[PDB]
Amino acid sequence: ACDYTCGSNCYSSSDVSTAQAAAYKLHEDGETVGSNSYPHKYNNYEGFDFSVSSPYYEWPILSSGDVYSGGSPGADRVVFNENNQLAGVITHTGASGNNFVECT
Ligand SMILES: Nc1nc2c(ncn2[C@@H]2O[C@H](CO)[C@@H](O)[C@H]2OP(=O)(O)O)c(=O)[nH]1
Numbered sequence: 424a425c426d427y428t429c430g431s432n433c434y435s436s437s438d439v440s441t442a443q444a445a446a447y448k449l450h451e452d453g454e455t456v457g458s459n460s461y462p463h464k465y466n467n468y469e470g471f472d473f474s475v476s477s478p479y480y481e482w483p484i485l486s487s488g489d490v491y492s493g494g495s496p497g498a499d500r501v502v503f504n505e506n507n508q509l510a511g512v513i514t515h516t517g518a519s520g521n522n523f524v525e526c527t
């Protein structure tokens with residue numbers, strides 16, 4: 424079973440922790456990856472009720488199992504905060520335009 428299901432993509436907690444760890448390191452060092460400059464701030468326009476406090480940052484989580492290193496980010500993202508706490512896992516899949524819905 425999946426801990427997080429984003430459309431057809433299935434993720435486990437370990438997939439999320441690995442992705443998040445790489446993103447937080449880049450965040451602490453002030454470095455970015457890709458044309459969209461990940462990780463970058465997630466404004467939470469959707470108004471998701473996260474358990475952890477703002478500010479939030481987003482990083483792509485890939486169905487391939489590899490950690491993002493540039494190129495297409497896919498539709499899935501891991502959202503984390505300043506204290507490296509997982510806020511949630513979201514996706515463009517099943518959401519209109521460039522909006523987001525939570526992964527179940
Ligand atoms: N829908 C949405 N997009 C956001 C938010 N914060 C940042 N973005 C980014 O804003 C732009 C327009 O939606 C996109 O670059 C999207 O990023 P990603 O595609 O990199 O996730 C947010 O809270 N909601």
Ligand SMILES: [Ca+2]
Binds near residue numbers: 435
């Ligand atoms: Ca996996």
